[PDB]
């Protein structure tokens, strides 16, 4: 549903 997203998180 997201045009821009990643599974990775900066923490």
């Amino acid at each position, epitope marked *: *549903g*997201k*045009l*821009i*997203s*990643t*599974t*990775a*998180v*900066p923490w």
Partner: antibody
Amino acid sequence: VQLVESGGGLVQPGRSLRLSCAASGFTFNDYAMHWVRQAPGKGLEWVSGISWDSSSIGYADSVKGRFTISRDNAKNSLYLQMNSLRAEDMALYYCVKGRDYYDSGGYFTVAFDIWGQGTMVTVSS
Amino acid sequence: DIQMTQSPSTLSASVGDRVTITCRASQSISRWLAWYQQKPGKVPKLLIYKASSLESGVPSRFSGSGSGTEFTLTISSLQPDDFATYYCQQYNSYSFGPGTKVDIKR
């Protein structure tokens, strides 16, 4: 905390410009970064964005195939390469810091919390 | 493609009024909606995000509600700092509403 855009100016239709944005006062690499534009006297239009880890990029339909977003984390900088410029691309271009949120297996922007003052792009023959 | 609409397009208000303005999405956007303030010649300012979270430092007279397709921004008691245009944006694909301008009633 600040976002300083440069690279704007006067360009003829069909020519190119490269915009720059230099970020300071926050950990630039930790955040999605975006470009938003505003034509004179008009509303806001999102142009392009890039996730904190550069793995995901998006463009407005109106610019895709002509604009390229990128970031250089080592230089705390965001860029927009704009080709085949048209009169309708005339606008003040803001560099914008995203604030991101994790939901349903994905990390995505939910707010634009810091905005640069903008660099003015004039497209005219 | 998600169309964001806003109503009213303009609003005449007085200091002390409670003003509520509306934003609507053409399909469900859950709670991924933010509200921005903008004044002539100035940069937009984040007010609310995730539909109802008030941004740090923003006065508490501002509140947002809604989920799905209908969203509202409320100013419980309009202050002179608040005459401005207000935009909503959805974060599935970043389209903005066309803005609501709140000017000074006379």
